[PDB]
Design a protein around this ligand. Structure first.
Ligand SMILES: *[C@@H]1O[C@H](CO)[C@@H](O)[C@H](O)[C@H]1NC(C)=O
Ligand SMILES: *[C@@H]1O[C@H](CO)[C@@H](O)[C@H](O)[C@H]1NC(C)=O
Lengths: 73, 73
């Protein structure tokens, strides 16, 4: 287990205004706890991503319909 | 070009204390301009990464010896 690592944080400072369709989303990532701010990250198709604010209804409803994104190692 | 996207920011709030060997690094990523803080991200082997503070000598010397990380699309 190679760990010279001090990872970067994934933060959401700007958020999706327009509702993203559920069909367009693969999974979600939670933002880093240091810069949390109730943001969520939806993994879209072809490598794309979108920050979404979890205090908004459609974000909560979508989050409840998707699993957390998996990671490599 | 699918863009429903509002990307997350890559930030560096904690930094590498111990110097990472140049041989262990593939390239570097600059942090997002919103949360810049003079941090740098070094891409390590087997998917790993490390935040490094660009006001420190070894970080500046290493940065000058590596190219910027490429991206998919
Ligand atoms: C995701 O955010 C929720 C709050 O909405 C929190 O309870 C949880 O610990 C976070 N999970 C991860 C895996 O970061
Ligand atoms: C990287 O940081 C330098 C300052 O050290 C800045 O001049 C530059 O605009 C940044 N480049 C990118 C590609 O983010």
């Amino acid at each position: 287990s190679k760990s010279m690592q001090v990872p970067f944080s994934r933060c959401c400072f700007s958020f999706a205004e327009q509702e993203i369709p559920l069909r367009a989303i693969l999974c979600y990532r939670n933002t880093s706890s240091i810069c949390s701010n109730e943001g969520l990250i939806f993994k879209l198709k072809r490598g794309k991503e979108a920050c979404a604010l979890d205090t908004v209804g459609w974000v909560q409803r979508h989050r409840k319909m998707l699993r957390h994104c998996p990671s490599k190692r």
